[PDB]
């Protein structure tokens, strides 16, 4: 799309790159109301480094690697409910 960037890129798309709504579309949380609680508690990394500010825009080439850190309570209880908690690599 070349000249019709006048009409589509709006608030509902430029906020769709946000880490809470990308988290909710990745189904890592129930809703935004506790997705912001998780990524403010500092459980969620993207790439290699942890990210804490809940206004971050995950880019195109980083949406694939926005995953929970090792050694965290939510990763531990996820692997516990799936009952696959391979406890060699910390969790």
């Amino acid at each position: 799309k070349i000249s019709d960037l006048e009409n589509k890129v709006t608030v509902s798309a430029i906020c769709r790159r946000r880490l809470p709504v990308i988290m909710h579309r990745l189904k890592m949380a129930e809703t935004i109301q506790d997705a912001v609680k998780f990524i403010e508690q500092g459980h969620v990394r993207v790439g290699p480094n942890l990210i804490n500010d809940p206004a971050y825009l995950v880019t195109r080439n980083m949406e694939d690697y926005v995953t929970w850190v090792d050694n965290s309570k939510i990763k531990k209880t996820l692997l516990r409910y799936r009952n696959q908690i391979d406890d060699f690599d910390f969790s």
Partner: peptide, 19 residues
């Protein structure tokens, strides 16, 4: 349901998965 299994997204979490 086979398509959702092939896209399972292995990092989903809710409050209901504690027991």
């Amino acid at each position: 349901l086979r398509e959702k299994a092939k896209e399972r997204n292995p990092d989903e979490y809710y409050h209901a998965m504690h027991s």
